[PDB]
Coordinates of C-alpha atoms and ligand atoms in Angstrom, one line a residue:
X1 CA -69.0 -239.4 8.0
X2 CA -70.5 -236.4 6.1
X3 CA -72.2 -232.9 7.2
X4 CA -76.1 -233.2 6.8
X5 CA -78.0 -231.8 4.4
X6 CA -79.0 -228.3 4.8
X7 CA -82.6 -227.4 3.7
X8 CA -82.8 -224.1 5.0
X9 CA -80.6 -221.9 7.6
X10 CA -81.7 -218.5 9.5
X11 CA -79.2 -216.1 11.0
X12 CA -80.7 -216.1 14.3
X13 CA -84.4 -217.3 16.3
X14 CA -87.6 -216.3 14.8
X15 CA -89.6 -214.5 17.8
X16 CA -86.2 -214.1 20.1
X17 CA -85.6 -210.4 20.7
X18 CA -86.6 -207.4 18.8
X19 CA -86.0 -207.9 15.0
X20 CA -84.5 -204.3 14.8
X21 CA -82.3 -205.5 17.4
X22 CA -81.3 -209.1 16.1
X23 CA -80.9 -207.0 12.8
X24 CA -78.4 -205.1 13.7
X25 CA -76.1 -207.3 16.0
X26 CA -75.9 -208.9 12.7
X27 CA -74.0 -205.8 11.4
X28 CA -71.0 -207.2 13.9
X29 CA -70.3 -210.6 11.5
X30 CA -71.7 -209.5 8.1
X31 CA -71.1 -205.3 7.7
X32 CA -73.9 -202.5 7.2
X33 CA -75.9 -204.6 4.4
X34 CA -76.5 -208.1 3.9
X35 CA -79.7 -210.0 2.6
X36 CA -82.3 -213.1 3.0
X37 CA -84.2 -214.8 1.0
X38 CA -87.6 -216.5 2.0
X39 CA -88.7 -219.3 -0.6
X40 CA -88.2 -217.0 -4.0
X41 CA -88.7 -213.7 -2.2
X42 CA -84.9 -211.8 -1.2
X43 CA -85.2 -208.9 1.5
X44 CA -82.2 -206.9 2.2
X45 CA -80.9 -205.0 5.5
X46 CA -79.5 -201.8 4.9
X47 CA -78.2 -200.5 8.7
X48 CA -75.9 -197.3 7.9
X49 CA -76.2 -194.0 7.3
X50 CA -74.6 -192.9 4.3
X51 CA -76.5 -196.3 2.4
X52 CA -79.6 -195.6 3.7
X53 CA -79.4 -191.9 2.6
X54 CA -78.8 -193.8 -0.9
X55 CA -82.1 -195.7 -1.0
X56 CA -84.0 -193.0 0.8
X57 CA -82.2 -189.7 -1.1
X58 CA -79.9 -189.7 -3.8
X59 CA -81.9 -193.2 -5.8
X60 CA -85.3 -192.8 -3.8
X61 CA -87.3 -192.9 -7.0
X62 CA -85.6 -196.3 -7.8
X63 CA -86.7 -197.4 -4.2
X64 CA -89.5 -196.1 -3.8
X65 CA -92.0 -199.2 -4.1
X66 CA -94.1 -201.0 -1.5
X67 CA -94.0 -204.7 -1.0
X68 CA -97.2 -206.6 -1.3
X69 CA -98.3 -208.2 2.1
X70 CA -101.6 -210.2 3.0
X71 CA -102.2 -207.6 5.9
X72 CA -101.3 -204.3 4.5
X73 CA -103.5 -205.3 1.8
X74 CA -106.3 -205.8 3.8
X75 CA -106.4 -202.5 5.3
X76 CA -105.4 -200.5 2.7
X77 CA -107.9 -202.2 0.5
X78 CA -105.6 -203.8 -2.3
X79 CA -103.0 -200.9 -2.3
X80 CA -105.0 -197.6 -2.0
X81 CA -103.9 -194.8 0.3
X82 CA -101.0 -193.1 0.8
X83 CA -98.7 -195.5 2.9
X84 CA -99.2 -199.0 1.7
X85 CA -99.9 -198.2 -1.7
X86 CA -96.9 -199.2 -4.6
X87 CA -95.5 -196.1 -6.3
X88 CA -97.5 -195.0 -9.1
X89 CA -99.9 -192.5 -10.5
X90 CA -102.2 -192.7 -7.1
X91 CA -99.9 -193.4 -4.8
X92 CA -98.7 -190.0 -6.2
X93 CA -102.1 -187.8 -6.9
X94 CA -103.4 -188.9 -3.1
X95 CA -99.8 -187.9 -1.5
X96 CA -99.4 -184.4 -3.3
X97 CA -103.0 -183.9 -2.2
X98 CA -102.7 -184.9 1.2
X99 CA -99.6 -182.2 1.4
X100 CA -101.5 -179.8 -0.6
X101 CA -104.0 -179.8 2.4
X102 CA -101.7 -178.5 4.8
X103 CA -101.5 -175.2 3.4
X104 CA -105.5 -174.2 4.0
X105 CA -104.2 -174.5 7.8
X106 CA -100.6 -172.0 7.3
X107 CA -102.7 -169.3 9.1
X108 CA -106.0 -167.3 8.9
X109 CA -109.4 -168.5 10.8
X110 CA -108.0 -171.8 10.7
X111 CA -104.6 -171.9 11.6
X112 CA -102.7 -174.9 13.3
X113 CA -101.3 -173.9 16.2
X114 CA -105.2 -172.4 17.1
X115 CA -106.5 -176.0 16.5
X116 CA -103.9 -178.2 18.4
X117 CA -104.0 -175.8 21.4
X118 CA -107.6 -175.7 21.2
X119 CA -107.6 -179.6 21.7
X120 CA -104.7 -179.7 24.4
X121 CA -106.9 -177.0 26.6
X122 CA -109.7 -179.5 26.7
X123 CA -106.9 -182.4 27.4
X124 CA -105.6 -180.3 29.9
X125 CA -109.1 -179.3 31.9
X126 CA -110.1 -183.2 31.8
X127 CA -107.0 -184.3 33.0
X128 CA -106.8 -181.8 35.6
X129 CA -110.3 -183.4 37.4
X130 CA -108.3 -186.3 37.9
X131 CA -105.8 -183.6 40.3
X132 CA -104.0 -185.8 42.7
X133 CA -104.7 -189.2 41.0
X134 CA -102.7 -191.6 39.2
X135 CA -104.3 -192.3 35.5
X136 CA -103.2 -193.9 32.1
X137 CA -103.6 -190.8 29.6
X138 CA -103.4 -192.9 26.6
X139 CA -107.1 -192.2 25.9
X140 CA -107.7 -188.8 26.5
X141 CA -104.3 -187.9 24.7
X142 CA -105.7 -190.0 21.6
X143 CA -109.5 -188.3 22.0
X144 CA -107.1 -184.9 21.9
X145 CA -105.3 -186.1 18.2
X146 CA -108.1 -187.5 16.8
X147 CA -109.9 -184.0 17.1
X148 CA -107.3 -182.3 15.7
X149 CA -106.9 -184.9 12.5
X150 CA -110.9 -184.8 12.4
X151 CA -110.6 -180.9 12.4
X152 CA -108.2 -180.9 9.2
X153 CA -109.7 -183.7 7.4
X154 CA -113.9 -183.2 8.1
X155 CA -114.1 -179.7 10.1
X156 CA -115.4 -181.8 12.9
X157 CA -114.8 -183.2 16.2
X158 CA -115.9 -185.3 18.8
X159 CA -117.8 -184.2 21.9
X160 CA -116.2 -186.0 25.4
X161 CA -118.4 -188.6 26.1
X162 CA -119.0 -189.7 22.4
X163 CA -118.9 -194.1 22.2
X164 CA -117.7 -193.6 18.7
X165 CA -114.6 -192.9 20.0
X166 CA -113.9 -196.0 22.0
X167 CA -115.1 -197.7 19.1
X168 CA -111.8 -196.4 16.5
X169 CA -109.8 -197.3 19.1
X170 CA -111.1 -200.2 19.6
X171 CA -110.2 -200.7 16.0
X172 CA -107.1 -199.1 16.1
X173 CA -106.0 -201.3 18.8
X174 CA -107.1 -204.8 16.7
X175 CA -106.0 -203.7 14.1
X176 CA -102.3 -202.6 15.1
X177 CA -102.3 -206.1 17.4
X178 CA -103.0 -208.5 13.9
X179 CA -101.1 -206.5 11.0
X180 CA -98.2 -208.2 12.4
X181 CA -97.3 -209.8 15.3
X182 CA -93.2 -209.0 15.0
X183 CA -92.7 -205.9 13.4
X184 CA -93.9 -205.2 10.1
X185 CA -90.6 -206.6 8.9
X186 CA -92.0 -210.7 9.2
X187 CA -88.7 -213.3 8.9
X188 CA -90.5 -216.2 8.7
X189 CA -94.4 -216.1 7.2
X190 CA -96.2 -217.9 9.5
X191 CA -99.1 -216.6 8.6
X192 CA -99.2 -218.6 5.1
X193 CA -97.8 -221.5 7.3
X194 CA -100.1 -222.9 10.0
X195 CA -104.0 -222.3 10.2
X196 CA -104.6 -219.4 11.6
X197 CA -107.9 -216.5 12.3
X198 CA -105.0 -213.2 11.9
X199 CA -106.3 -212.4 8.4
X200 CA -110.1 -212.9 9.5
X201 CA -110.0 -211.0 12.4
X202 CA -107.8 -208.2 10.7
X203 CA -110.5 -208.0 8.1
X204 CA -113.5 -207.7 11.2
X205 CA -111.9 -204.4 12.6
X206 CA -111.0 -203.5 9.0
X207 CA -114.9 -203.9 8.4
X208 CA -115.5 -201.9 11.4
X209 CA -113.6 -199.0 10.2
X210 CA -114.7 -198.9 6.8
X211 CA -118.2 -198.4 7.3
X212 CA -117.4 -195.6 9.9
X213 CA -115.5 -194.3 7.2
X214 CA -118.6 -195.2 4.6
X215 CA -120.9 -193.4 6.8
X216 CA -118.8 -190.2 7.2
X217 CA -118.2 -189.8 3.5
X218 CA -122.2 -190.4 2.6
X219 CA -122.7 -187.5 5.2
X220 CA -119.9 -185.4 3.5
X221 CA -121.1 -185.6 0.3
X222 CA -124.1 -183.8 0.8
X223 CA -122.2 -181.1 2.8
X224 CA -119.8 -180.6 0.1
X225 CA -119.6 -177.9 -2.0
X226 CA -116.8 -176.2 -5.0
X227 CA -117.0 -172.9 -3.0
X228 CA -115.2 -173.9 0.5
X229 CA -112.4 -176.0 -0.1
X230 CA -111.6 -176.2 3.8
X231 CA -110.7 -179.5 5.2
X232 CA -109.1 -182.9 3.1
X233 CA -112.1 -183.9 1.9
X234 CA -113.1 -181.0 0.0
X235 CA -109.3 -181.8 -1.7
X236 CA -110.0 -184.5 -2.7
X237 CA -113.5 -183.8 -3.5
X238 CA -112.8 -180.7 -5.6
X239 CA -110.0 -182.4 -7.3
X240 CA -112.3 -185.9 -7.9
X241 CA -114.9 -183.3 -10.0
X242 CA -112.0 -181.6 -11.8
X243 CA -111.2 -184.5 -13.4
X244 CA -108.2 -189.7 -14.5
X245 CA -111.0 -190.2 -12.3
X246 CA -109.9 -194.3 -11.5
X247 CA -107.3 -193.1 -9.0
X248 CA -110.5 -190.9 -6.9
X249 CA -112.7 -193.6 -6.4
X250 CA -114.6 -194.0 -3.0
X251 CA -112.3 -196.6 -1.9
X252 CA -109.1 -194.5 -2.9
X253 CA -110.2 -191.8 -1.1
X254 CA -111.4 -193.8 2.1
X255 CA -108.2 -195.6 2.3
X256 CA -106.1 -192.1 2.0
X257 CA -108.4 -190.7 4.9
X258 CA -107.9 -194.0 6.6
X259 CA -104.0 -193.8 6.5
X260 CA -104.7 -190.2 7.4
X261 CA -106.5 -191.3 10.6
X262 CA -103.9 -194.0 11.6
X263 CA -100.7 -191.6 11.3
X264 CA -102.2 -188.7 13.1
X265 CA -103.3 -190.4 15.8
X266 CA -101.1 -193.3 16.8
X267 CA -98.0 -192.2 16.2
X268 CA -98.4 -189.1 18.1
X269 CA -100.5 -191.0 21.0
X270 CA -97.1 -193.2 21.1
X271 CA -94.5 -190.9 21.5
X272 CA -96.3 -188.3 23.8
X273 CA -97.1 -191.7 26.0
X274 CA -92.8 -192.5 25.1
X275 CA -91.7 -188.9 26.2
X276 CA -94.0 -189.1 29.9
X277 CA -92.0 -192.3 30.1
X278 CA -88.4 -191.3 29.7
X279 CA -88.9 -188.1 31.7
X280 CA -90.4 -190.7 35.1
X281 CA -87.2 -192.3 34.6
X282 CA -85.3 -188.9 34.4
X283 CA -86.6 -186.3 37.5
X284 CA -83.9 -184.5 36.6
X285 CA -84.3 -183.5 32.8
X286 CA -87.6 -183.2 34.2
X287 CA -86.7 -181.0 36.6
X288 CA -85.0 -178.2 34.4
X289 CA -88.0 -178.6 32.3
X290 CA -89.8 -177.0 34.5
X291 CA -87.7 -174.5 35.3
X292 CA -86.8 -173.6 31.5
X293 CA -90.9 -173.3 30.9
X294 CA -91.2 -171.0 33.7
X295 CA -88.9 -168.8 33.4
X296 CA -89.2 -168.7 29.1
X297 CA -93.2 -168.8 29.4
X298 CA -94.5 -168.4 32.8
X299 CA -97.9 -168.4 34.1
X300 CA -98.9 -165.6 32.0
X301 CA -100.1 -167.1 29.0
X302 CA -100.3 -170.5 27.3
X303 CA -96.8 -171.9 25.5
X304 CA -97.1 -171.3 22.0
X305 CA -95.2 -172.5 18.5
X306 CA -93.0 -169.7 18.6
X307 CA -91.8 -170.5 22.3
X308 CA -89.5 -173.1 20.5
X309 CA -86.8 -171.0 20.0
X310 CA -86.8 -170.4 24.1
X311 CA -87.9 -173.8 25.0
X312 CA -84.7 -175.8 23.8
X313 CA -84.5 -178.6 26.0
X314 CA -87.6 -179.4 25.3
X315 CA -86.9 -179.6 21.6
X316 CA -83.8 -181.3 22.4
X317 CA -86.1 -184.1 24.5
X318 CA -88.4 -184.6 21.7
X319 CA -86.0 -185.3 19.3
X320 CA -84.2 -187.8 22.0
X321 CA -87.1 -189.8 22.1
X322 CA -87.4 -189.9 18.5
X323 CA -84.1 -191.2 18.5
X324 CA -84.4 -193.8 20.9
X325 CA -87.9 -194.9 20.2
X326 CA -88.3 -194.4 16.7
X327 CA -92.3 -194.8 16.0
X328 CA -91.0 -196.9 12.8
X329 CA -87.4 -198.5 13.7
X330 CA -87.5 -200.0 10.2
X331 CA -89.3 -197.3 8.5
X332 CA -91.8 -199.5 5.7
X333 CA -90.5 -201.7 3.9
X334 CA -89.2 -200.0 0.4
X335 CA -89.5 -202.3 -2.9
X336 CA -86.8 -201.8 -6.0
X337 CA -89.2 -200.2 -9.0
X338 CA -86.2 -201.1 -11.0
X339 CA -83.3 -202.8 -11.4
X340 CA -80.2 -200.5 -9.7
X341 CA -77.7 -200.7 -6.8
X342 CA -77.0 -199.6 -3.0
X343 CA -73.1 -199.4 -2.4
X344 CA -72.1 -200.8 -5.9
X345 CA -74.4 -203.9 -4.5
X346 CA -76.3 -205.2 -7.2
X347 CA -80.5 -205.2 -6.1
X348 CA -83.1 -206.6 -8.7
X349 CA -86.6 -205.1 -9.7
X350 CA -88.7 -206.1 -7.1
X351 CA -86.2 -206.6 -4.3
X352 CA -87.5 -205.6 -0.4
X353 CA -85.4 -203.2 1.1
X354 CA -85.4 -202.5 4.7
X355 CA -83.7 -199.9 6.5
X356 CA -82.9 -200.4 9.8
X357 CA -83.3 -196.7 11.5
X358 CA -82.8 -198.4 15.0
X359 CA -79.2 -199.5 13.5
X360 CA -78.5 -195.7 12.2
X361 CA -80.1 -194.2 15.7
X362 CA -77.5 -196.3 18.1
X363 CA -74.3 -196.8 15.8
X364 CA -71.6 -196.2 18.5
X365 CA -69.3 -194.2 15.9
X366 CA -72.2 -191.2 15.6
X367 CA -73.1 -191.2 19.0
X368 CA -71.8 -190.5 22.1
X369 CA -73.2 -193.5 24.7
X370 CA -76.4 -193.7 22.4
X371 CA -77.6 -196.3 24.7
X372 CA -78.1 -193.3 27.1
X373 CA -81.1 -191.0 27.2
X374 CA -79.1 -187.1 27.0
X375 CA -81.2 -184.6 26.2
X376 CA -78.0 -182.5 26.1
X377 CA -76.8 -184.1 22.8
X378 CA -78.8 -181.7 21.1
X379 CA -77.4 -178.5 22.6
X380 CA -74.4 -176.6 21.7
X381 CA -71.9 -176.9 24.9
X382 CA -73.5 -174.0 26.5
X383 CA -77.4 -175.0 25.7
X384 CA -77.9 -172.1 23.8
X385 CA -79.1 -173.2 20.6
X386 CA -80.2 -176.8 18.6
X387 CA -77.8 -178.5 17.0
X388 CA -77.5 -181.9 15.0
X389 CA -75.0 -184.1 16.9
X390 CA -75.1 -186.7 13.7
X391 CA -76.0 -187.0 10.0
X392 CA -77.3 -190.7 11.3
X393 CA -80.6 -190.0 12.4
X394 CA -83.8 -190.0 10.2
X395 CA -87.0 -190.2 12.5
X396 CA -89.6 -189.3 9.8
X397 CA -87.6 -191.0 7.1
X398 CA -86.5 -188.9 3.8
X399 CA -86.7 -188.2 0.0
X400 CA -90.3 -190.2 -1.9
X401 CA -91.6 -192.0 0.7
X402 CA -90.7 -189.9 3.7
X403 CA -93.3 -188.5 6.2
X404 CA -96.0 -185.7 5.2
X405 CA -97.3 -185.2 8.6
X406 CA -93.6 -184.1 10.2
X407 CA -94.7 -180.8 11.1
X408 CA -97.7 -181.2 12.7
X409 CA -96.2 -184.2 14.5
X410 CA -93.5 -181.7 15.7
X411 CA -95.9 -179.3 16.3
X412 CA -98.4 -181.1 18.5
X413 CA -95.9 -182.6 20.3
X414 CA -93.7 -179.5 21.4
X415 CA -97.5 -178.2 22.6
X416 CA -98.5 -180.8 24.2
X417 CA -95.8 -181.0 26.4
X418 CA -95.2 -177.4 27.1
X419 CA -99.0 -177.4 28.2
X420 CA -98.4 -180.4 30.5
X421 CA -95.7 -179.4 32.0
X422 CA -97.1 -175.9 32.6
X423 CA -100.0 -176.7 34.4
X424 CA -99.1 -180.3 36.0
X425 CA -96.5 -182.1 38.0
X426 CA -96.5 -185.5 36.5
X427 CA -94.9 -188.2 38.8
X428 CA -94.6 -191.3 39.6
X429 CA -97.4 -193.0 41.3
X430 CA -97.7 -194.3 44.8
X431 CA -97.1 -197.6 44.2
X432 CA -93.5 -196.5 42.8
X433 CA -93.9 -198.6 39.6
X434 CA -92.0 -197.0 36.4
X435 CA -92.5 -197.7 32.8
X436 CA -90.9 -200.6 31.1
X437 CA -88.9 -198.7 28.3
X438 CA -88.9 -202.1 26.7
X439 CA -91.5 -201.3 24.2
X440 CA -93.3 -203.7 22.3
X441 CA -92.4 -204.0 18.4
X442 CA -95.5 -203.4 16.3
X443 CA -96.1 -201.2 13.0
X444 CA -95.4 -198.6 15.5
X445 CA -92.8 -199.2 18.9
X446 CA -95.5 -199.1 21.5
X447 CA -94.6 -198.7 24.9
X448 CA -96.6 -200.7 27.9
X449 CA -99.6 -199.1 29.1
X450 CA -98.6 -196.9 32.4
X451 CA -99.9 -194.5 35.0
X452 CA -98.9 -191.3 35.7
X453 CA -99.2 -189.2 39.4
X454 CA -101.3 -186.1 38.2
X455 CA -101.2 -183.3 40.1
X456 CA -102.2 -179.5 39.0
X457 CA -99.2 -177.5 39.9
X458 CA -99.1 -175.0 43.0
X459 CA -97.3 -172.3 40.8
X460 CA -100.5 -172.5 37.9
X461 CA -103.2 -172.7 40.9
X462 CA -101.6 -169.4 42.5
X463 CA -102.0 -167.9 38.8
X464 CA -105.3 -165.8 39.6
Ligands
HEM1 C1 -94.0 -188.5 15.6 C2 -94.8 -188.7 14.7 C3 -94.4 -189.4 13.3 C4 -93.3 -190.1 13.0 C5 -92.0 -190.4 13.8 C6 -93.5 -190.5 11.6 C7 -92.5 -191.2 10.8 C8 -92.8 -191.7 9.6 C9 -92.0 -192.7 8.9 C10 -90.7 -193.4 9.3 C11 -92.6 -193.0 7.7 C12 -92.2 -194.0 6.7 C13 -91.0 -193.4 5.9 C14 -90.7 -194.5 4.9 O1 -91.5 -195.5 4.8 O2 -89.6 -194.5 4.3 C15 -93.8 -192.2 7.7 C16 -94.7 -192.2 6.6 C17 -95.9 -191.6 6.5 N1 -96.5 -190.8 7.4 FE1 -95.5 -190.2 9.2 N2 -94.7 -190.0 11.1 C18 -95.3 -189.4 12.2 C19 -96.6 -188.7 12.1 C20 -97.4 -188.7 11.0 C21 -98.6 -187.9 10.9 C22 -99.1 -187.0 12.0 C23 -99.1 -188.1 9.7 C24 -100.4 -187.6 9.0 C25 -100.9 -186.3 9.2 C26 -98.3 -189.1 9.0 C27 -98.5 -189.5 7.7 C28 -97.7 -190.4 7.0 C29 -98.0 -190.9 5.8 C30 -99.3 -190.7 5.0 C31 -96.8 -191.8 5.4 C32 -96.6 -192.6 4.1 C33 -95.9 -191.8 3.0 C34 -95.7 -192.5 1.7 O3 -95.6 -193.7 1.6 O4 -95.6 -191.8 0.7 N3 -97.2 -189.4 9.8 N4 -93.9 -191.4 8.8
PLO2 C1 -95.5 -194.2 11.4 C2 -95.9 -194.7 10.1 O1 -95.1 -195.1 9.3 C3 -97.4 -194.7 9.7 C4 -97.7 -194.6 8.2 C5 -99.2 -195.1 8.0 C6 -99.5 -195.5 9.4 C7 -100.7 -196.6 9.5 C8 -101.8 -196.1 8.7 C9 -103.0 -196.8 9.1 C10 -103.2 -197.5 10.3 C11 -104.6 -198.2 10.5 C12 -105.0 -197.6 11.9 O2 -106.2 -198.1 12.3 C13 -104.0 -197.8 13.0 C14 -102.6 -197.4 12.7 C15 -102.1 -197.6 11.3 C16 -101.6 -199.1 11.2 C17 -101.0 -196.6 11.0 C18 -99.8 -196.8 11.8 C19 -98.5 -196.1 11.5 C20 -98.3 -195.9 10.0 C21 -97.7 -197.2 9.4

């Protein structure tokens, strides 16, 4: 009377709870870091601080890979880009160029905090027609970032009203829905399994977005010129005729634009559409919202960047939401360039290595009730100044790999809600239905489309 034979054994049910979560109630039974291995593939779960700071920081260069996946290599064309692509010589050239960018937009005629709030002032008269109804602002929020991202990559935007917009998020939306179905971290891949359309219908929006991006770079190239290096393009334009010319390609520089696109615009869409959320679940942050923003800003003028330093709870809100909704709770998955270590751990060449941020943003020793929305945990006892509550928090990631879009993602969030919340009470609507704050695990944590009470605010109206 003998135990069977074992063929293959899984920690806990594919498809049963968010795998960020499942992840880390794993930590309970088997510590911080622990591993699986999926035919000859091994993946290993790294859920503390002070290790993930070791992958990320002090050996990022040793961790700095991408693993190979069907999907990610269908839209980022075999590895181009910025986000998908494996360390290496263009991984590196697009990336220092992408970041290079950012400095023709420090100030002058063309400065950043002129374009965001040139985008939110059209957000805000749009939404402001819809005065006293409940809407769903996910699409005028994302026709808002997609200016601004069209404005530093192209010097262009879109006029209201203009299809081609509900045709990238049309797009955005398939292809978000098919590059996984869990998160980006697959346990099991099904995919390779059972006959399925995923990787067909992945490549039809794929197509879709390619020759909009084809189109726009045939159009470009004829506007181009040495003389005004302006926008992205011109980047990596000026730097393709300056030279090593493989890595600046069409496709390379379409696929960078590409991860450009997606970043800018669906991570920010996410957690403006998150922060709405948490603050209809929490009248009362909301509440002193308000009442910080009037009395630091008023009805005088429009908030601006440097209304940070007055507007601290809403600084402190921001990064709560970015805490408890990270846009990426496992970051991307990292790849071991070479043989090395995490916590005197052996880990091969070629060894996936997630870290789980969700783990690091709720570990019960670095937080007080981090199951809790508090604001407050990011203000000194008095709510004078910002402060960092705990080392274990890494939104935008850190060291190699880490995010080049922090600022303006900081940026055109603070704005966009100190606009809101100037000019609009934003409540719940008649029907009394609130958010799930569930959220839906894809590439990024989506939340459930909701509506929002939109009323122009008595105090802004009275302004004249
Ligand atoms: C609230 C908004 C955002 C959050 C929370 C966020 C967070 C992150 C995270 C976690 C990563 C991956 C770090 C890793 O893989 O270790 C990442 C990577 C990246 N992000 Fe952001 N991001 C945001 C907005 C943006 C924006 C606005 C842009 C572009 C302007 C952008 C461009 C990129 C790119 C290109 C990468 C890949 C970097 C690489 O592999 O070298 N992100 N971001
Ligand atoms: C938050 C984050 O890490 C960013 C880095 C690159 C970003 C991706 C880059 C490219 C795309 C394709 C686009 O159509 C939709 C979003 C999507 C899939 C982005 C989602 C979020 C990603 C993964």
């Amino acid at each position: 009377l003998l135990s069977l034979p074992l063929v293959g054994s899984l920690p806990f049910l594919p498809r049963h709870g968010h795998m960020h979560n499942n992840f880390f109630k794993l930590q309970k039974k088997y510590g911080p870091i622990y591993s699986v291995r999926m035919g000859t593939k091994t993946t290993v779960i790294v859920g503390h601080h002070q290790l993930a700071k070791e992958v990320l920081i002090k050996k990022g260069k040793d961790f700095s890979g991408r693993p190979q996946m069907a999907t990610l290599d269908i839209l980022s064309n075999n590895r181009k880009g910025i986000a998908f692509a494996d360390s290496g010589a263009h991984w590196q050239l697009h990336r220092r160029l992408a970041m290079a960018t950012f400095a023709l937009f420090k100030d002058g005629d063309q400065k950043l905090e002129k374009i965001i709030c040139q985008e939110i002032s059209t957000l805000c008269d749009m939404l402001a027609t819809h005065n006293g109804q409940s809407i769903d602002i996910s699409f005028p929020v994302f026709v808002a970032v997609t200016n601004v991202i069209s404005l530093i990559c192209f010097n262009t935007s879109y006029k209201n009203g203009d299809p081609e917009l509900n045709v990238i998020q049309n797009y955005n939306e398939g292809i978000i829905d098919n590059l996984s179905k869990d998160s980006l971290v697959d346990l099991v891949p099904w995919l390779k399994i059972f006959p399925n359309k995923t990787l067909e219908k992945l490549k039809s929006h794929v197509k879709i977005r390619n020759d909009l991006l084809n189109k726009i770079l045939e159009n470009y190239k004829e506007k181009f010129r040495s003389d005004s290096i302006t926008n992205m393009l011109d980047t990596l334009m000026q730097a393709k005729m300056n030279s090593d010319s493989e890595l600046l390609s069409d496709n390379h520089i379409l696929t960078t634009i590409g991860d450009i696109f997606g970043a800018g615009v669906e991570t920010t869409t996410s957690v403006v559409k998150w922060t709405l959320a948490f603050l209809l679940h929490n009248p009362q942050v909301k509440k002193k919202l308000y009442e910080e923003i009037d009395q630091n800003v008023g009805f005088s003028r429009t908030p601006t960047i440097s209304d940070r330093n007055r507007l601290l709870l809403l600084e402190a809100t921001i990064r709560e939401v970015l805490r408890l909704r990270p846009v990426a709770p496992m970051l991307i998955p990292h790849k071991a360039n070479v043989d090395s270590s995490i916590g005197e751990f052996a880990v091969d060449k070629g060894t996936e290595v997630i870290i789980n941020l969700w783990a690091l943003h709720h570990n019960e020793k670095e937080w007080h009730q981090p199951d809790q929305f508090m604001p407050e945990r990011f203000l000194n006892p008095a709510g004078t100044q910002l402060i960092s509550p705990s080392v274990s928090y890494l939104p935008f990631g850190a060291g190699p790999r880490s995010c080049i879009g922090e600022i303006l993602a900081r940026q055109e969030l603070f704005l966009i809600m100190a606009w809101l919340l100037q000019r609009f009470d934003l409540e719940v609507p008649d029907d009394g239905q609130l958010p799930s704050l569930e959220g839906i695990p894809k590439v990024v944590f989506l939340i459930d489309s909701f509506k929002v009470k939109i009323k122009v605010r008595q105090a802004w109206r009275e302004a004249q």
